[PDB]
Amino acid sequence: VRSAEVGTDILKALAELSPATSLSRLAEHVGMPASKVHRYLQALIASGFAVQDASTNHYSLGREALRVGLAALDSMDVLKSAAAPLAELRDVLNETCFLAVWGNRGATVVQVEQAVRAVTVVTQVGSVLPLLGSSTGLVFAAFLPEREVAELREEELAGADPAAYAVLLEGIRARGLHAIHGLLMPGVEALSAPVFDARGRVAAVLTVVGPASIFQAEEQGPAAERLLATTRAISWRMGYDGT
Amino acid sequence: VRSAEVGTDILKALAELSPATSLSRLAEHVGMPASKVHRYLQALIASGFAVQDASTNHYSLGREALRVGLAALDSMDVLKSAAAPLAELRDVLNETCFLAVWGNRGATVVQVEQAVRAVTVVTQVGSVLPLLGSSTGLVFAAFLPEREVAELREEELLADPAAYAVLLEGIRARGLHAIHGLLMPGVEALSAPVFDARGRVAAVLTVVGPAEEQGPAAERLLATTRAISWRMGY
């Protein structure tokens, strides 16, 4: 019955309580009487899901807590978690949305939800976008280390203003997304936001696209919030705490 | 208090059977009726320790499980201490890097940072590598009290003892071991210890691919592992 909830509701608040916690701080977190917490604590210590330190008496997560968690982290897959919200974001905007991840050649489109209109522009799965010429490529540059972008970026500048470049990447973070007006192809406007994993690493970039007529790619227009709501959702479902 | 633990029991099956499982396969594993399992599954879903996949009777671990994984790692001063430096080192090294703590069953890998690269070589976060068959374990053998690992060493049975002794003196003198092929024909290995506040080995940092005790990669690994000690150890 009810006892399964309270058990892991306690485990969830133990994790939330840093590395070590006392009983009163624990019961105050999950909002239950101290006595019931102490009772279920005992079970969680038996099951290995919690431990009590020998010299300080503080409660912390057990090795069972660690092993389940590492199974979870081994199971993260932005391609799984994103597939439904991508299609939902497409259906509310009726604009083509796509997911890209970072591959040996940069932004690589791996999944696409097209807009159904008489005629529509699209990326296609398997397309590699430019690092500095697309909105997908700029979010990547904004959020990945300098070291894993620089080489392909240097291959790109054989085909200026570094200062302006550095101020723009600081902008894309301050703002959390990026809009482009035809930069990759004039007359097509894109919008891009990043998706993070549990550990905060850039998992993917999610991106809305469409010609200037129907789609206004403004960094603060109702598409932008839908975009962010979608990407913050995909993130939080992968464990990301939002900071 | 009794059925508090069947809740977590189903959690542990969900982990063993991850990424996903049919409810029926999950029930056979725990040896309980499928209806009883199905109901406990909803308790954890409300808690967020489990979700239900696109097949509306197929389950997988929930977002809270990641939270508990990461807190557990924070709680042993490995997470926020090694999170960055492990990914810096992958960046410069051009090869997959990973971190392993000493767990109940041996060296258990707690974070894997893989290179961006046509073909890499990975190990699963949360998997266990052998004490004597892996550079990650051999290092643990070199720097851990003989007491703590004598069980698995005896369990795996370099047999002759004096051969053991030579290799583990050498690994301490050098400060790392690099394997070639003891996991599998074609490993690169190269592992180095990480020391906690009191000087014990709290983790091992292992880069992998298809392997030198002496060249360029060894210094940046030793540089990153010798550094990482002070914000965890001192």
Domains and CATH numbers, chain A: 2-74 (1.10.10.10), 78-238 (3.30.450.40)
Please state, in angstroms and rounded to a whole number, the distance separating the CA atoms of residues A190 and B96: 33
The torsion angle over the Cα atoms of residues B223, B88, B205 and B207, rounded to 10 degrees, is: -100
- Does the beta-carbon distance from A15 to B67 stay under 8 Å? yes
3-state secondary structure of B11: helix
Cβ contact A97:A226 at 8 Å: no
Start-to-end CA distance of chain B, whole Å, equals 42
Q: What is the dihedral of CA A162, A164, A167, A173, to 10 degrees?
A: -90
Closest among B68, B62, B61 to B16, alpha carbons compared: B61
Q: Give yes or no for a contact between B184 and B165, defined as CB atoms under 8 angstroms apart.
A: no
Q: Is A3 on the interface with B (CB under 8 A)?
A: yes
What residues in B contact A8, CB-CB < 8 Å? Answer: 7-8, 11, 43-44, 47, 49, 64
- The answer to whether the peptide bond before residue A85 is cis (omega within 30 degrees of 0) is no
Q: Which residues of B182-192 are buried (b: 16+ CB within 10 A; e: fewer)?
A: bbeeebbbbbb
Separation CA A180–CA A130 (nearest Å):
13
Cα–Cα distance for residue pair B143/B198, rounded to 1 Å: 13
Q: Structure tokens of A9?
A: 């509701």
Q: Rounded to an integer, what distance in angstroms lies between the CA atom of residue B22 and that of residue B55?
A: 9
Helix axis angle for A3-16 and A34-46, nearest 10°, is: 90
> DSSP 3-state assignment of B113?
strand
Q: Do A12 and B126 touch (CB under 8 A)?
A: no
Contact in structure between A71 and B15 (CB atoms under 8 Å): yes
In 10 A of CB B17, how many CB atoms? 18
CB within 8 Å: A71 and B8? no
**Which of A4, A16, A18 has the CB atom closest to B43's CB atom?**
A4
Task: Report which of A209, A178, A195 is spatially closest to residue A79, judged by C-alpha positions.
Answer: A195
Nearest to A6 by CA among B4, B214, B32: B4
Q: How was this structure determined?
A: X-ray
A192 beta partners: A178, A207
CA distance B58 to B37: 12
Q: Is B31 left (phi over 0), alpha (psi -120 to 50) or beta?
A: left
Q: What is the 3-state secondary structure (H, E, C) of B162-178?
A: HHHHHHHHHHHHHCCEC
3-state secondary structure chain A: CCHHHHHHHHHHHHHHCCCCECHHHHHHHHCCCHHHHHHHHHHHHHCCCEEECCCCCCEEECHHHHHHHHHHHCCCCHHHHHHHHHHHHHHHHCCEEEEEEEECCEEEEEEEECCCCCCCCCCCCCCECCCCCCHHHHHHHHHCCCHHHHHHHHHHCCCCCHHHHHHHHHHHHHHCCEEEECCCCCCEEEEEEEEECCCCCEEEEEEEEEECCCCCCCCCCCHHHHHHHHHHHHHHHCCCCCC
Q: CB-hemisphere CA count at 13 Å for B23? A: 17
Nearest to A67 by CA among A47, A49, A43: A49
Query: How far is B100 from B125, CA to CA, in rounded Å?
Result: 9
Residue A6: list chain B partners with CB under 8 A.
4
Structure resolution, Å: 2.5
Q: How many residues does chain A have?
A: 243
State whether residue B118 sits within 8 Å of chain A by CB: yes
Question: From the CA of A84, how many Å to the nearest CA of chain B?
Answer: 9
Residues in chain B: 234
For A66-88, give one letter per residue: b (16+ CB within 10 A) or e: bbbbbbbbbbbebebbbeebbee
**CA atoms of B4 and A43, how far apart (whole Å):** 7
Name the residue among B8, B76, B124 with its Cβ closest to that of A74: B124
> Cα–Cα distance between A86 and A107 in angstroms, integer?
17
**C-alpha atoms less than 13 angstroms from C-alpha of B105 in its C-beta half-sphere:** 9
Chains A, B: CB pairs < 8 Å: 182
Picking from B219, B197, B180, B194, the residue whose alpha carbon sits closest to that of residue B98 is B194
A122 CB contacts (<8 Å, ≥6 apart)? A96, A112, A114, A209
| Amino acid occupying residue B207 | V
Half-sphere exposure for B80 (CA within 13 Å, toward CB): 9
What span, in angstroms and rounded, lies between the C-alpha atoms of B41 and B102?
A: 31
The answer to whether the Cβ–Cβ distance between B118 and A102 falls below 8 Å is no
Q: In Å, how far are A218, B164, B166, B176 from B158, measured between CA atoms?
A: 65, 6, 11, 18
Q: End-to-end CA distance of chain A, in Å?
A: 36
Sequence-ordered list of residues with C-beta below 8 angstroms from that of A55, at least 6 positions apart, any chain: none
d(CA A211, CA A188): 4
Listed by number, the residues of chain B in 7-26 with a beta carbon closer than 8 Å to a beta carbon of chain A are 7-9, 11-12, 14-16, 18-19
Q: How far apart are CA B160 and CA B230, in angstroms?
A: 37
Q: Does B81 touch chain A (CB under 8 A)?
A: no
Task: Determine, for residues A18 and B71 on separate chains, whether the beta-carbon distance falls below 8 Å.
Answer: yes
Rounded Cα distance, B68 and A70, in Å: 9
Q: Which three-class secondary structure state does DSSP give residue B228?
A: helix
**Torsions phi, psi for A41 (to 5 deg):** -50, -50
DSSP three-state, residue B12? helix
From B2, B11, B3, select the one nearest B47 (Cα to Cα).
Answer: B11
